[PDB]
Amino acid sequence: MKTNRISFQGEAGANSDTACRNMFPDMEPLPCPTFEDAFNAVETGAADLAMIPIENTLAGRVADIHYLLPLADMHIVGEYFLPIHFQLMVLPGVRREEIKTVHSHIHALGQCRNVIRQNGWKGVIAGDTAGAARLVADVKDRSMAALAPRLAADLYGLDILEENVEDSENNVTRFVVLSKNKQWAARPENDERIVTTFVFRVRNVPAALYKALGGFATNGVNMTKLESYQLGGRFIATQFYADIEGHPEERSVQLALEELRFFTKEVRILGVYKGSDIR
Amino acid sequence: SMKTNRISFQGEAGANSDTACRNMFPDMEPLPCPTFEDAFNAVETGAADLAMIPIENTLAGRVADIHYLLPLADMHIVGEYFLPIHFQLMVLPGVRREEIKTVHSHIHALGQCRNVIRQNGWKGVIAGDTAGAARLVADVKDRSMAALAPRLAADLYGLDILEENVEDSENNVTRFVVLSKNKQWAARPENDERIVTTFVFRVRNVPAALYKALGGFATNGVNMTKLESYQLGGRFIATQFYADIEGHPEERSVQLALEELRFFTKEVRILGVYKGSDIRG
Numbered sequence: 324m325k326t327n328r329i330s331f332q333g334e335a336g337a338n339s340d341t342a343c344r345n346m347f348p349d350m351e352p353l354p355c356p357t358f359e360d361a362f363n364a365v366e367t368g369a370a371d372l373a374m375i376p377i378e379n380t381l382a383g384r385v386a387d388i389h390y391l392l393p394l395a396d397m398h399i400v401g402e403y404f405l406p407i408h409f410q411l412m413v414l415p416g417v418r419r420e421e422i423k424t425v426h427s428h429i430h431a432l433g434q435c436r437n438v439i440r441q442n443g444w445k446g447v448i449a450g451d452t453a454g455a456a457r458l459v460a461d462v463k464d465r466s467m468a469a470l471a472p473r474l475a476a477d478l479y480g481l482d483i484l485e486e487n488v489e490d491s492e493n494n495v496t497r498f499v500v501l502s503k504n505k506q507w508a509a510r511p512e513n514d515e516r517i518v519t520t521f522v523f524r525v526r527n528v529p530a531a532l533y534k535a536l537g538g539f540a541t542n543g544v545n546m547t548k549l550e551s552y553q554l555g556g557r558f559i560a561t562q563f564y565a566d567i568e569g570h571p572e573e574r575s576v577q578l579a580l581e582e583l584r585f586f587t588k589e590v591r592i593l594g595v596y597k598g599s600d601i602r
Numbered sequence: 603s604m605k606t607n608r609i610s611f612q613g614e615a616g617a618n619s620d621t622a623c624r625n626m627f628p629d630m631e632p633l634p635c636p637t638f639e640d641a642f643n644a645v646e647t648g649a650a651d652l653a654m655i656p657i658e659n660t661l662a663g664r665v666a667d668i669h670y671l672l673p674l675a676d677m678h679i680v681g682e683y684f685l686p687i688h689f690q691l692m693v694l695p696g697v698r699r700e701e702i703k704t705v706h707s708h709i710h711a712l713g714q715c716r717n718v719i720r721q722n723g724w725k726g727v728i729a730g731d732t733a734g735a736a737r738l739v740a741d742v743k744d745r746s747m748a749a750l751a752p753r754l755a756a757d758l759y760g761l762d763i764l765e766e767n768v769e770d771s772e773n774n775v776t777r778f779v780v781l782s783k784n785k786q787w788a789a790r791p792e793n794d795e796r797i798v799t800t801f802v803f804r805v806r807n808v809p810a811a812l813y814k815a816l817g818g819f820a821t822n823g824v825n826m827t828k829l830e831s832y833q834l835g836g837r838f839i840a841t842q843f844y845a846d847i848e849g850h851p852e853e854r855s856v857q858l859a860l861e862e863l864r865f866f867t868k869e870v871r872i873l874g875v876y877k878g879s880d881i882r883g
């Protein structure tokens with residue numbers, strides 16, 4: 324029985340929460356303190372899906388999908404890209420002149436340095452960004468401001484003094500949607516975008532990765548993610564996490580994968596899912 | 603600037619990062635910093651001569667995004683370090699196992715030590731930092747409070763280690779890189795010494811583009827031990843790669859591979875040339 328819950332790591336109002344609401348508006352987000360807990364909610368049947376961030380353009384917190392996903396009995400059934408924006412929020416009726424300190428995650432402060440220095444404020448560490456909004460609403464100190472996603476302003480009843488105050492623009496986080504059941508996207512018939520995510524092992528010897536990539540190179544398969552991971556503590560063998568643009572039933576991918584299987588061990592397809600238009 | 607003999611690390615005194623600083627640079631004075639960025643900035647401003655930064659951990663622990671930070675800093679890798687990660691159950695001096703009710707640690711640490719919390723009927727309690735949990739236990743002086751922390755924190759806070767190496771899974775290793783503001787390359791090996799070269803390069807996001815860039819390493823016997831993709835900007839037009847190879851840029855084989863890499867890439871930047879840990883053998 325489907326519980327209609329989608330787990331994420333963090334507090335209510337976070338960017339992960341925004342991703343759940345944007346892509347699955349009719350679902351009920353389920354906050355979890357850690358990524359592992361967000362995975363575990365799907366394994367136990369508490370949540371139908373999990374929304375897990377894996378890439379962020381400006382060195383943000385992302386889950387080690389290469390470690391967690393292969394240990395799960397789970398599959399990637401979608402992806403999502405959310406542009407990240409920060410909002411300067413205060414208690415209702417608090418004026419700009421009253422603010423002395425701005426509370427956010429220590430990492431968030433460094434991405435919003437321009438407005439903190441231009442206004443002469445002191446950035447203050449907070450355990451969690453959405454928690455910073457929660458903290459301001461709970462402490463009820465008018466001098467304390469928070470930097471949080473737009474969603475946290477509405478949830479915690481805080482006023483947004485300034486919009487999109489982040490230093491850099493074009494800050495995007497990539498999520499993957501996880502499920503316990505193996506759902507593959509249908510083979511494209513009219514040039515639709517499909518992503519296949521898989522892992523494989525090679526020996527840690529020269530050209531071993533080269534051998535594994537040979538089939539995609541000569542079959543015109545575009546690879547869009549590739550991360551190395553040395554197995555155990557030793558340097559004897561290496562596992563790779565990879566995304567390709569293609570469906571496993573396509574002849575070109577079938578040929579690349581067959582060549583990959585001769586040169587590697589333990590090839591596991593972790594998902595076959597629709598790709599975002601940003602590609 | 604003036605050499606301060608300080609090495610910055612992210613965390614509180616007694617952390618695993620501090621352990622790496624003391625093991626590898628015993629005569630330096632570790633300089634705690636609340637964030638990785640602050641540990642970088644300590645080197646940029648001259649507060650610290652070196653920075654000890656974790657970049658790989660076997661069980662999904664917290665590491666700095668070296669691929670983002672190091673290319674934007676003007677810093678170099680001048681060393682690496684591999685530290686086996688272990689947790690110690692520590693208590694106030696003379697406290698008996700029967701007295702403990704709560705175990706305090708970082709939430710990720712509690713998640714790696716579930717067996718000893720369950721076997722003894724204790725309640726794990728969240729703490730912001732693992733070494734901080736040891737500090738908290740020594741300060742509160744509540745005999746019922748135990749901590750899970752690195753061995754170093756026990757010596758610093760005068761705590762008794764009730765049980766050793768209590769973590770669930772073994773083979774938990776963290777890889778650090780040693781950073782510097784000034785460039786220094788290890789000398790070219792003459793007798794099969796271990797040397798690592800770390801670099802970034804960009805290719806177009808089209809089929810076979812990475813394949814071309816690796817071609818030179820493949821046919822010259824250059825072993826690559828790390829490779830990470832990073833799609834540039836918001837678009838999917840170009841991709842940056844972070845890579846470690848075992849070799850020195852003056853060796854003929856590496857010279858040829860890098861030359862072939864330069865024909866097939868843009869913006870090749872060598873980020874460091876440093877001695878490799880014996881763990882590579």
Ligand SMILES: N[C@@H](Cc1ccccc1)C(=O)O
Nearest residue numbers: 528530531532551826827828
């Ligand atoms: N060392 C192997 C596999 C490998 C490549 C890149 C990074 C990590 C491992 C090779 O050079 O082909």
Ligand SMILES: N[C@@H](Cc1ccccc1)C(=O)O
Nearest residue numbers: 546547548807810811812831
């Ligand atoms: N997309 C390019 C480069 C690339 C490879 C792997 C991961 C990311 C980018 C290729 O197929 O060669």
